[PDB]
Design a protein around this ligand. Structure first.
Ligand SMILES: Cc1cc2nc3c(=O)[nH]c(=O)nc-3n(C[C@H](O)[C@H](O)[C@H](O)COP(=O)(O)OP(=O)(O)OC[C@H]3O[C@@H](n4cnc5c(N)ncnc54)[C@H](O)[C@@H]3O)c2cc1C
Ligand SMILES: Cc1cc2nc3c(=O)[nH]c(=O)nc-3n(C[C@H](O)[C@H](O)[C@H](O)COP(=O)(O)OP(=O)(O)OC[C@H]3O[C@@H](n4cnc5c(N)ncnc54)[C@H](O)[C@@H]3O)c2cc1C
Ligand SMILES: CCCCCCCCCCC1=C(C)C(=O)C(OC)=C(OC)C1=O
Ligand SMILES: CCCCCCCCCCC1=C(C)C(=O)C(OC)=C(OC)C1=O
Ligand SMILES: [S]
Ligand SMILES: [S]
Lengths: 421, 421
């Protein structure tokens, strides 16, 4: 309200949950901060691949949100937004209630566009997914069912995907698990299918020796890999694959039977956000400026996977670049600062900073991780590392982040640099 | 003097030059800051290997100090200290003059202990060195003489060495240069001799896949490599090598003829510092606490290669761990803060922080670099990277640091992190 702005954060994920705490800390008791999310629980998404192979469980990586944000003075609504009226500044919830805002920060993450590939929805066939804890459990359940009746395996990433690390990770840990149970030899064909133009492109034109290391890894595990692939449909428990050349021409079509499958889908913007006239690009991603502010609506900000970031290359089969945790947090931090500035008469000048991608993939005792920045080459940092110390860092970070999400974030978040100081 | 403390910095190198600027900035016009050094010029030491192969020249990497520090109010004495009387707080210079201090910060770097291996001094035989710009020129001169009368090459690192990166670097660029001139095939034997227990140990128990990458690199260039080696003497243009086993027992003795050679020597503390009773360990390195303060003299601080750091392993052939640039700068920053604190009644609490090693080795179009921390495994960061982007960073950093040494340093030096912000 006038003189007491009401700020709403839409989505309680990697970006949204920190956004709620930070917003409240920034604004204080004089302003209302409301967090709205489809689920009543936070999940640490980088852990989902492990849930999907049964190496972690839901209660290790998820917890109920209400108590933690409420004790900070944050209002929590465990309801999905179905409609956003940018003109009246009203959000319509699933239960038909409306919530008014003075400022809105959209942190809704990805819509999993299973509809791009008929039959690829985890509920429509054998092709599962590990992006959400709900789906990773379903993935594991199916994995258990492959244990009973072994058959062909197909793991990978669909056309349009932007999140490739997890595909490599899932394929490696499945291989690893097939052995620790002792049943790898029961598989007629383990196949990696990706829209990447080459192994380890990762949607970022490769990083360090990602190609050689990942290529060698898949071979070591007896996994046959195909690049430049798009799945046209999943039907009758068969995946129909078209492989193309550098110019898009078909070089082969394949019909792969699937007993157990997992393909990372393409991401789009969620429907409530995509549905706002003039807010988004055609993929449903919010068009924002360097300050995280909507180009159309001055009182709408956005952060996380939800924002649009222009491509910098165009691959034979459509692919996207990932939006990862450190950059997401920088976007959140910028949006919070600049909303505060708005409430006080100034144009916030804070930006998300240099584009970067960071990803940690834990294999069990050793992990691989990459750091790349900026987006285009030649980069200032282009590192792909492998070692047990990567595994140890992933373990350490998940523990940290989950704790921070329960205890609150002030904060110039990552002073996770004082492993130096 | 009383109420107006006189601070002396001994040595104008990677640690000492920044120390002078920072000290002066910290203290201001009310205190005298004197910088004393053996040479009247600063040299960027990581560039010396390239000087040693003729890929850089002295005037690209060195410049006269006087004007730059004097215009900051810093007094500069281009004289070597020969004696330090810790009790009277008097430094005796080469010309017999004495300089009194209230606080002394020792930044004298390494004494190159060529005397450990009879005949290994660059002026005594064919075994040269690239640690100083003076010696790297002499190295190149000899390289030019091998071009005229080709013969056996031996590059590597002596027992007791702590600086291995440069040995690998020099060996690779020499190979590279032998080809760009087209004369590699004229060499009867190119041999890498190291005190490391294995290739890529680097005095730090390896980092990432340093072993595999360096091993492969030496093979690619047609260089035969021997580990666990100590050179007993260089004589008659022959290097006498003893190779040992895990327990120190001789497993072979070798006599290698050398037309052109380069071995990184062991480092000790310089004589003026080692000569101070009770100041140093037996190697002549200053014993300091976490605050960079001498354990014996409260008004003596130290930074850089000059300080003692306890070993954490004991290798078949004696080796040391390197002291590198970022950690050196942290030591300098700590010493400055804590001297200032002393001048104002408090115990400075600032430390050098977590032990770390960083090293960049430029091969020409691509470079290798490593980052390791902390000292013992399992580490929080254990990365060894290779790529043209490493070369680009080395180029960028040398330009930066040289500029900073002419323009002055405030400073919380490395905010060379805003390639993020
Ligand atoms: C399998 C996987 C592994 C990954 N691993 C890493 C990694 O190791 N490192 C890294 O840096 N990044 C990783 N990422 C990427 C990125 O960090 C995560 O995707 C991160 O969770 C994205 O943050 P976000 O806040 O944009 O979206 P999310 O975390 O997905 O949160 C969006 C929130 O909005 C909610 N929401 C959606 N629609 C509505 C609606 N209409 N109304 C109300 N709420 C709604 C959702 O329920 C969700 O809570 C990984 C991603 C995936 C999929
Ligand atoms: C070949 C080589 C390559 C290296 N590459 C890297 C790298 O890539 N990255 C990295 O982080 N580190 C690197 N290092 C290591 C380290 O960063 C350098 O050795 C650095 O120069 C050490 O800093 P320092 O201040 O301790 O000593 P120095 O830079 O050696 O300075 C000591 C100064 O004290 C002076 N001095 C000595 N005795 C006296 C005396 N009695 N009186 C007056 N003055 C005296 C010397 O003339 C010198 O100016 C490299 C080292 C070497 C040898
Ligand atoms: C040099 C650029 C910054 C280095 C990155 C910081 C180290 C931690 C990894 C990043 C990360 C973030 C931020 C993160 O938010 C996240 O969760 C989604 C991860 O998955 C575990 C991450 O790996
Ligand atoms: C994560 C730990 C810190 C990262 C290091 C910063 C990046 C620059 C490299 C370090 C370096 C320093 C500090 C440095 O002082 C120096 O000169 C002696 C180098 O040689 C070129 C260096 O490579
Ligand atoms: S998913
Ligand atoms: S040297």
């Amino acid at each position: 309200m006038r003189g007491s702005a009401h700020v709403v954060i839409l989505g309680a994920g990697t970006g949204g949950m920190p956004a709620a705490y930070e917003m409240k800390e920034a604004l204080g008791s004089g302003h209302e901060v409301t967090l709205i999310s489809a689920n009543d629980y936070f999940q640490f998404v980088p852990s989902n691949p492990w849930v999907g192979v049964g190496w972690k469980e839901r209660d290790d990586i998820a917890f109920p949100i209400r108590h933690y944000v409420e004790r900070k003075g944050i209002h929590f609504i465990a309801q999905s937004a179905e409609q956003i009226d940018a003109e009246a500044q009203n959000i319509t919830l699933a239960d038909g209630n409306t919530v008014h805002y003075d400022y809105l920060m959209i942190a809704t993450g990805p819509k999993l566009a299973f509809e791009n590939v008929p039959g690829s929805d985890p509920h429509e066939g054998p092709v599962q997914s590990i992006c959400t804890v709900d789906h990773a459990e379903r993935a594991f359940a199916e994995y258990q069912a492959l244990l009973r009746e072994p058959g062909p395996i197909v793991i990978g990433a669909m056309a349009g995907a932007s999140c490739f690390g997890p595909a490599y990770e899932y394929a490696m840990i499945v291989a690893s698990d097939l052995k620790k149970r002792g049943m790898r030899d029961k598989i007629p064909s383990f196949t990696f299918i990706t829209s990447e133009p080459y192994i380890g492109h990762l949607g970022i034109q490769g990083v360090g020796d990602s190609k050689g290391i990942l290529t060698k890894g898949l071979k070591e595990e007896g996994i046959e890999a195909y690049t430049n692939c798009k799945v046209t449909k999943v039907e009758d428990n068969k995946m129909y694959v078209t492989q193309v050349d550098e110019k898009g021409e078909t070089i082969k079509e394949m019909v792969l039977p699937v007993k157990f499958g997992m393909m990372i889908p393409a991401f789009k913007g969620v429907p409530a956000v995509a549905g706002v006239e003039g807010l988004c690009n055609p993929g449903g991603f919010v068009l924002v400026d360097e300050h995280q502010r909507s180009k159309k609506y001055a009182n709408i900000f956005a952060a996380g996977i939800a924002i649009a970031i222009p491509p910098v290359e165009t691959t034979p089969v459509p692919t996207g670049a990932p939006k990862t945790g450190y950059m997401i947090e920088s976007m959140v931090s910028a949006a919070v600062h600049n909303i505060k500035a708005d409430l006080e008469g100034r144009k916030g000048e804070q930006t998300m900073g240099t584009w970067n991608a960071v990803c940690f993939a834990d294999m069990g005792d050793r992990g691989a991780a990459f750091i790349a920045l900026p987006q285009l080459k030649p980069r200032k940092v282009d590192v792909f590392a492998y070692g047990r110390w990567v595994h140890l860092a992933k373990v350490a970070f998940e523990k940290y982040f989950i704790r921070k999400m329960k205890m609150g974030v002030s904060e110039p978040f990552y002073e996770k640099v004082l492993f130096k100081m």
